[PDB]
Amino acid sequence: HMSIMKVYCQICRKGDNEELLLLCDGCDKGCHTYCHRPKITTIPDGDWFCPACIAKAS
Numbered sequence: 560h561m562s563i564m565k566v567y568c569q570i571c572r573k574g575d576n577e578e579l580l581l582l583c584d585g586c587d588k589g590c591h592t593y594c595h596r597p598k599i600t601t602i603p604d605g606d607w608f609c610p611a612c613i614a615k616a617s
């Protein structure tokens with residue numbers, strides 16, 4: 560048995576603009592820079608944790 564995974568943005572539900580589609584190293588969900596509010600205007604240079612994961616960790 561097999562599993563295919565394709566990441567879609569939590570917000571717009573599209574999987575394009577993959578360079579801007581930030582993948583949470585915490586929970587593996589995706590969200591484009593420009594679909595966040597406030598918009599993310601820095602592409603993370605290393606790893607990304609999403610707002611939901613940061614709020615749970617704190």
Ligand SMILES: NCC(=O)Nc1nccs1
Pocket residue numbers: 577578579580581582583584602603605606607
């Ligand atoms: N988990 C890190 C991450 O998603 N980095 C990315 N940089 C550019 C696009 S995605």
Ligand SMILES: [Zn+2]
Pocket residue numbers: 568569570571572573590591594
């Ligand atoms: Zn999006």
Ligand SMILES: [Zn+2]
Pocket residue numbers: 583584585586587588608609610611612
């Ligand atoms: Zn997360």
